[PDB]
Amino acid sequence: AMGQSTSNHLWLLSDILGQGATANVFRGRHKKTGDLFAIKVFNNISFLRPVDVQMREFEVLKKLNHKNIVKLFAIEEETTTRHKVLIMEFCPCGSLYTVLEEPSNAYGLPESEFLIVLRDVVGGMNHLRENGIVHRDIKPGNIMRVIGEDGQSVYKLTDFGAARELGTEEYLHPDMYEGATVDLWSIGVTFYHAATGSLPFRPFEGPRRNKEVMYKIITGKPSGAISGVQKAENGPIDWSGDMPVSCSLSRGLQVLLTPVLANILEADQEKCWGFDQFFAETSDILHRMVIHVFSLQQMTAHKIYIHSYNTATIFHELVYKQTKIISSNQELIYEGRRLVLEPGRLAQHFPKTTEENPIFVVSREPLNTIGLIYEKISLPKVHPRYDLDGDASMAKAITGVVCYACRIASTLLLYQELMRKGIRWLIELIKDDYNETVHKKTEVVITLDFCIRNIEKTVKVYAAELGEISDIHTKLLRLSSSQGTIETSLQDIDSRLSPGGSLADAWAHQEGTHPKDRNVEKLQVLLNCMTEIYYQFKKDKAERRLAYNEEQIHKFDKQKLYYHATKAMTHFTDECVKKYEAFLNKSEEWIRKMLHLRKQLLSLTNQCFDIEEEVSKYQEYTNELQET
């Protein structure tokens, strides 16, 4: 139907991307080439119209180019309405807000994608800072997302610099609600929103006329607390200076991110950071590499953030901070074999590691098995009301919960499949310790056999001599007897290491769940059905009203949305969870038995060294008798 146009560009009014106060953004094309561009048409521009100031201004923002900033191509005039039109680059993927609309990110973005967000936002914000221009209005809605040539997302900034001739209410600064601090505030609220999937400060009712509590929350600013939420109408505020349990970020990252947000979120400029403080700490985080470590003792995976130039000493310290294991008690295993790391080895030369192929950690000291620690979240109540807005919010909520359940279920399967491998590596690695103890035994055996034979032979050939010989014979028997005890007790250990020797990993190949079960795929199928319905309810909300047929289809699918979710949650707890807990229960059992065996093997090995020094004082005794 009706559509605006320009000298070089044209677009339909049906194609809308963003609707702002001063301008609107449409999906447009170049009249000649046909390439897609973002069309910024200014609404209500008469009482201003500074074609003198805005001329050079738009010419300045034109030459301004950055990877983390939405590019401005040209400034043109609408054909009929004669409105000024800016030509931005089209971002098909939408904004960060669009990403947060996804149920998969209802409880926070994936860790890698979050690192992309942090890096790009900082880069773009820094580039704006170097030009002196201040934003203050930074929100996921105005942070665009594009797909790079390498496939990875790239985030850019677009809406700014409109404060000249004239922040979001949830992203507003306390004193500004009614200094460069006002910047970092919205940035912090954004970062928490990307990590948690929700806003830092939430009243029970929300952003309304009962948002009076919110201002009290924001002006509250207790210590270094990064979030505060009241769980009831006009109730107390639950404060926390840490990340939620449902957060998809690794523990190592949360340790670094927590102080950052805490220092940039307060009304006082006293303790608040500057852009240099902020940039320094943030870039520091971005420069660090990733160390994937799976602790078998607690059955917990870890991501340790270290610079490439750091040593293995700081590495052991950080691993201690997360796993509570002494640096001297930390033992590493990689690809079936143990790996000895020098205290001063750089992180650049570390082996290739993934979360599905990490570095296992075994300890001499007994440690409790923790397993995966997650937030148990149930489904919300589904109301029979036809409220399109309600059905949309309920759809995102309930699908987000199921998304979380499927995410946890995938993690549980990872822990089990990693556990089985780590155990298989360990039993063969300790078996190698048994293999070397056999060798050291044979050394003492060869030493024993010949040394005793000489002394048993010297009496056959060639009071005084008899007394010496007898004492030596006894001494040789004192050691050879214990050598026989160890010899057979080691066969008992080998019997344990043998298949079906009560240390076998057969239990671990039975109790838990396997990729053969396809439990994650089973959950995803129902999750896809729900996700489809969700985006449909979004499409129905935009129309504000539906036809009779669409009305009942909306109701039918809404009921199926519940049935899908319950079916998934039931399969989650009755299959994935229970079999995981059983695998974890028997995990403690095998751990006790393994550490006990390891203690036995240790002692029996050291005893060979104890008798190794004894035969060195005897083989060089009589054989080395002095005479002219």
Ligand X SMILES: O=C(NCCCNc1nc(Nc2cccc(NC(=O)N3CCCC3)c2)ncc1I)c1cccs1
Check binding of 480 to ligand X (CB under 6 A).
no
Residue identified by tokens 């004192």 is 478
Structure tokens at 518: 């396809």
Measured in whole angstroms, how far is the alpha carbon of residue 553 from the centre of its chain?
Answer: 39
Stretch that binds ligand X, among 17-25, 51-59, 189-197, 208-216 (CB under 6 A): 17-25
Check binding of 168 to ligand X (CB under 6 A).
no
Q: CA end-to-end span of the chain, whole Å? A: 123
Assess contact for 293 and 318: CB atoms under 8 A: no
Check binding of 447 to its own copies (CB under 8 A).
yes
Stretch that binds its own copies, among 121-129, 185-193, 281-289, 549-557 (CB under 8 A): 549-557
Element (H, E) at 470: helix 464-497
Backbone angles phi, psi at 359, to 5 degrees: -100, 115
Furthest C-alpha separation in the chain? 131
Give the residue, chosen from 9, 11, 17, 114, that forms a contact with ligand X under the rule CB under 6 A.
Answer: 17
Check binding of 407 to its own copies (CB under 8 A).
no
**Strands ordered across the beta sheet of 227-229:** 201-202, 227-229, 238-240
Rama region for 590: left / alpha / beta (φ>0; ψ in -120 to 50; rest): alpha
Assess contact for 319 and 361: CB atoms under 8 A: yes
Report how far residue 590's alpha carbon sits from residue 584's, in angstroms, rounded to the nearest whole number.
10
Minimum CB distance to ligand X, residue 597 (Å): 59
Check binding of 335 to its own copies (CB under 8 A).
yes
* Interacting positions 484-503 with ligand X (CB under 6 A): none
Residue (of 590, 612, 279) closest to 439 by Cα position: 612
Question: How far is the CA of 138 from the CAs of 124, 135, 469, in angstroms?
Answer: 11, 7, 93
Question: How far is the CA of 53 from the CAs of 39, 50, 65, 118, 165, in angstroms?
Answer: 21, 6, 21, 34, 10
Check binding of 23 to ligand X (CB under 6 A).
yes
Those residues whose C-beta lies under 8 Å from the C-beta of residue 543, and which sit 6 or more positions away, are none
**Dihedral angle over CA of 338, 344, 349, 353, nearest 10:** 50
Minimum CB distance to ligand X, residue 168 (Å): 12
Report how far residue 423's alpha carbon sits from residue 511's, in angstroms, rounded to the nearest whole number.
14
Binding mask 135-174 for its own copies (x = CB under 8 A): ------------xxxxxx----------------------
Check binding of 18 to ligand X (CB under 6 A).
yes
Structure tokens at 85: 């039109």
Measured in whole angstroms, how far is the alpha carbon of residue 186 from the centre of its chain?
Answer: 23
* Interacting positions 488-547 with its own copies (CB under 8 A): 518, 521-522, 524-525
Check binding of 105 to ligand X (CB under 6 A).
no
Check binding of 161 to ligand X (CB under 6 A).
no
Active-site residue, 137 included: yes
Give the residue, chosen from 212, 428, 465, 550, that forms a contact with its own copies under the rule CB under 8 A.
Answer: 428
By C-beta, is 165 or 620 nearer to ligand X?
165
Assess contact for 112 and 70: CB atoms under 8 A: no
Assess contact for 92 and 144: CB atoms under 8 A: no
Minimum CB distance to its own copies, residue 522 (Å): 6
Helix/strand/coil for 393: helix
The active-site residue, picked from 15, 35, 137, 268, is 137
Question: How far is the CA of 301 from the CAs of 360, 372, 502, in angstroms?
Answer: 9, 8, 27
Give the residue, chosen from 1, 2, 21, 33, that forms a contact with its own copies under the rule CB under 8 A.
Answer: 33
Give the residue, chosen from 386, 450, 563, 609, that forms a contact with its own copies under the rule CB under 8 A.
Answer: 450
* Interacting positions 70-89 with ligand X (CB under 6 A): 70, 88
Count the residues of the shown chain that bind ligand X, applying the rule CB under 6 A.
19
* Interacting positions 556-615 with its own copies (CB under 8 A): 556
Partner from ligand X, its own copies, none binding residue 25, C-beta < 5-8 Å depending on class: ligand X
Check binding of 38 to ligand X (CB under 6 A).
yes
Check binding of 90 to ligand X (CB under 6 A).
yes
Minimum CB distance to its own copies, residue 357 (Å): 10
Check binding of 16 to its own copies (CB under 8 A).
no
Partner from its own copies, ligand X, none binding residue 23, C-beta < 5-8 Å depending on class: ligand X
Report how far residue 433's alpha carbon sits from residue 438's, in angstroms, rounded to the nearest whole number.
9
Partner from ligand X, its own copies, none binding residue 24, C-beta < 5-8 Å depending on class: ligand X
By C-beta, is 454 or 585 nearer to its own copies?
454
Report how far residue 7's alpha carbon sits from residue 429's, in angstroms, rounded to the nearest whole number.
74
Partner from ligand X, its own copies, none binding residue 90, C-beta < 5-8 Å depending on class: ligand X
Applying CB under 8 A, which residues contact its own copies? 29, 33-35, 147-152, 335-337, 421, 424-425, 428, 439, 442-443, 446-447, 450-451, 453-454, 457, 461-462, 518, 521-522, 524-525, 552-553, 556, 619, 623, 625, 627
Active site residues: 137
Applying CB under 6 A, which residues contact ligand X? 16-18, 20, 23-25, 38, 70, 88, 90-91, 94-95, 98, 142, 144, 158-159
